Amino acid sequence: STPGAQEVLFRTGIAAVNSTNHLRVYFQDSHGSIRESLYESGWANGTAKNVIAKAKLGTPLAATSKELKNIRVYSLTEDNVLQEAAYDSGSGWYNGALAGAKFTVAPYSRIGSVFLAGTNALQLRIYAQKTDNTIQEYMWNGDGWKEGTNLGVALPGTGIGVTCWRYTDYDGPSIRVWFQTDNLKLVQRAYDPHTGWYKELTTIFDKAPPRCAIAATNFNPGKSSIYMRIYFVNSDNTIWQVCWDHGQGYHDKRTITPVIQGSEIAIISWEGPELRLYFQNGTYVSAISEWTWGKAHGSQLGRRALPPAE
Numbered sequence: 067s068t069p070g071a072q073e074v075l076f077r078t079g080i081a082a083v084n085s086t087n088h089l090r091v092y093f094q095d096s097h098g099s100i101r102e103s104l105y106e107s108g109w110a111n112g113t114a115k116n117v118i119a120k121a122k123l124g125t126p127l128a129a130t131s132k133e134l135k136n137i138r139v140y141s142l143t144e145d146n147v148l149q150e151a152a153y154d155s156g157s158g159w160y161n162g163a164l165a166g167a168k169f170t171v172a173p174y175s176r177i178g179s180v181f182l183a184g185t186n187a188l189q190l191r192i193y194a195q196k197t198d199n200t201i202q203e204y205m206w207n208g209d210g211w212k213e214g215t216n217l218g219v220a221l222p223g224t225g226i227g228v229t230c231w232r233y234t235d236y237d238g239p240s241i242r243v244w245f246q247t248d249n250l251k252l253v254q255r256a257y258d259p260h261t262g263w264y265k266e267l268t269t270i271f272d273k274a275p276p277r278c279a280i281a282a283t284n285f286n287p288g289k290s291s292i293y294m295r296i297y298f299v300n301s302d303n304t305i306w307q308v309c310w311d312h313g314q315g316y317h318d319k320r321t322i323t324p325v326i327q328g329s330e331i332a333i334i335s336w337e338g339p340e341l342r343l344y345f346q347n348g349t350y351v352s353a354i355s356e357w358t359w360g361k362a363h364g365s366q367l368g369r370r371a372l373p374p375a376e
């Protein structure tokens with residue numbers, strides 16, 4: 067290890083946002099603060115002068131953004147209340163209004179979060195697990211934080227992946243949410259603007275480790291076409307990837323890169339496609355590492371140890 071790496075909590079929650087290749091990564095330090103490391107033509111920060119929030123130890127972490135003009139980062143308080151750190155260009159970092167709504171979740175709850183694609187308005191959908199194990203949507207459409215749709219029972223402590231896009235032939239957002247059911251299967255729930263929430267659970271993986279991390283992204287939306295990638299930590303201690311490609315659907319499942327036992331993961335993407343995955347693989351014991359995919363080089367390890375580790 068290194069003194070910087072030692073600051074990073076083992077099995078920390080990880081989230082990330084970006085605008086093309088301008089990247090922000092969020093993780094929890096060993097004292098329970100949430101920090102931001104940044105990539106602007108090089109990695110920086112992740113230090114004790116870059117704290118944006120403070121959360122229970124072991125907190126789930128989720129983030130979402132409009133480019134890097136608006137960023138939101140979600141975690142839990144010590145009383146398992148959903149809370150929000152918010153950044154707006156020219157306003158700085160501040161506490162969002164979410165904690166004020168006092169949404170109490172299961173202590174083992176994960177969190178998923180997205181801005182709704184295809185509008186300039188700041189509309190948010192947040193997904194977490196309540197004490198009855200249901201996955202609950204919470205929303206902001208400008209008028210205060212309100213409960214939205216409840217997506218049904220999931221495994222206690224299930225990972226929660228979520229992504230959102232707008233098809234170019236549609237008048238609204240599409241959302242997909244992935245989590246794990248009591249049978250240990252990995253499933254999809256879907257929302258399209260005219261159908262609303264589909265009733266059916268779609269299976270994407272037959273059996274996965276209990277409470278494995280789950281993270282998803284999308285790229286190249288078009289006329290009734292999308293590309294999606296969903297990542298999870300499998301029983302061979304690697305991140306696996308489930309591909310949705312237009313015309314083929316859920317046609318490829320494969321290992322991507324090794325991780326430490328119970329690593330969390332984050333994924334971002336941009337058009338190309340460029341993929342960046344973040345996780346812990348044992349580098350300096352506790353540092354966060356990056357995996358990359360692009361057309362130029364395909365699958366390649368990226369930054370070995372994110373700030374503050376190096």
Ligand SMILES: CO[C@@H]1O[C@@H](C)[C@@H](O)[C@@H](O)[C@@H]1[Se]C
Nearest residue numbers: 090102104134135137153159
């Ligand atoms: C210019 O501000 C940076 O970019 C913002 C989008 C953000 O993530 C700030 O925390 C960092 Se700190 C230098």
Ligand SMILES: CO[C@@H]1O[C@@H](C)[C@@H](O)[C@@H](O)[C@@H]1[Se]C
Nearest residue numbers: 138152162163164188190206
């Ligand atoms: C306008 O409300 C802010 O942006 C919204 C999209 C949201 O995250 C609110 O909680 C914060 Se509170 C200032």
Ligand SMILES: CO[C@@H]1O[C@@H](C)[C@@H](O)[C@@H](O)[C@@H]1[Se]C
Nearest residue numbers: 191203205213214215239257
């Ligand atoms: C229009 O319906 C709302 O926005 C959709 C995009 C979605 O997130 C619905 O569950 C909620 Se219903 C509380």
Ligand SMILES: CO[C@@H]1O[C@@H](C)[C@@H](O)[C@@H](O)[C@@H]1[Se]C
Nearest residue numbers: 242254256264268292294310
């Ligand atoms: C068009 O299919 C839908 O959208 C895709 C992106 C996907 O999530 C399918 O499972 C559902 Se249901 C066939």
Ligand SMILES: CO[C@@H]1O[C@@H](C)[C@@H](O)[C@@H](O)[C@@H]1[Se]C
Nearest residue numbers: 295307309318339341359365
């Ligand atoms: C052709 O490359 C695929 O799409 C890339 C964007 C990527 O995510 C690869 O792992 C997969 Se491998 C089925």
Ligand SMILES: CO[C@@H]1O[C@@H](C)[C@@H](O)[C@@H](O)[C@@H]1[Se]C
Nearest residue numbers: 087105342356358367368369
């Ligand atoms: C050009 O640098 C790469 O793309 C950046 C956007 C970034 O994530 C770097 O760590 C990697 Se290292 C192969």
